[PDB]
Amino acid sequence: FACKTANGTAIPIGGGSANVYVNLAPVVNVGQNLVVDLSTQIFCHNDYPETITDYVTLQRGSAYGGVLSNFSGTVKYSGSSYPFPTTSETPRVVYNSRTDKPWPVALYLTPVSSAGGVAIKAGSLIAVLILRQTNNYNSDDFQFVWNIYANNDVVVPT
Ligand SMILES: OC[C@H]1O[C@H](Oc2ccc(-c3ccccc3)cc2)[C@@H](O)[C@@H](O)[C@@H]1O
């Protein structure tokens, strides 16, 4: 099992970490949702689908900076919703193909009532997503860290 970003930065067999830089809605109103969709940025595949089932959770979705102080957050994993920042590991998803498949992860962040001005600072770290990979074959328990970085400021109209 391995993953890669849309720009081609890879995290090989065994885990590791990568930086993902995402473009955001530049202007977001209170009562409106800012969508960070990593299913366009993060892909993974199973190296031996003939024999092995890879199982993939979001183990932890952690929040920093302006995403942590100005937004209320939900995280959609493979079709179900959860709090973001997360409260427990999600259910396991199966990668059974060598073709690279999206990691089905999307942040849905809503500005808090007191939000206003520059809610997210360009180039800050807005989130750390922990991908957890196991299988049905050995005792492999591997961690693919995604450090999510803002490509641009986000303003909440005042
Ligand atoms: O995606 C599946 C796995 O691929 C990696 O591990 C192995 C371990 C063993 C074999 C193998 C076994 C017998 C003959 C030829 C190859 C192939 C891959 C490893 O990434 C792991 O976590 C992941 O479950």
Numbering used by the authors: 1 to 158
Excerpt from the paper describing this PDB structure:
E. coli clinical isolates express the FimH adhesin, which consists of a mannose-specific lectin domain connected via a pilin domain to the tip of type 1 pili.
In this study, novel crystal structures of tyrosine-gate mutants of FimH, ligand-free or in complex with heptyl α-d-O-mannopyranoside or 4-biphenyl α-d-O-mannopyranoside, are combined with quantum-mechanical calculations and molecular-dynamics simulations. As no crystal structures carrying either the Y48A or Y137A mutation were available for BF, we generated all MD simulations from the WT structures after introducing the mutation in silico (see §2.11). In wild-type FimH, the mannosides exhibit largely enthalpy-driven binding, in agreement with previously reported results for other monomannoside and oligomannoside derivatives and for a series of biphenyl α-d-mannosides. The lack of the Tyr137 side chain can thus not be compensated for, probably because of its larger distance from the mannose. The steric hindrance by Tyr48 renders the binding highly dynamic, whereby the aromatic ligand seeks multiple stacking modes predominantly with the two tyrosines, thus including Tyr137. In contrast to HM, the flexibility of BF is almost not restricted in the WT binding site and also not in the Y137A mutant.
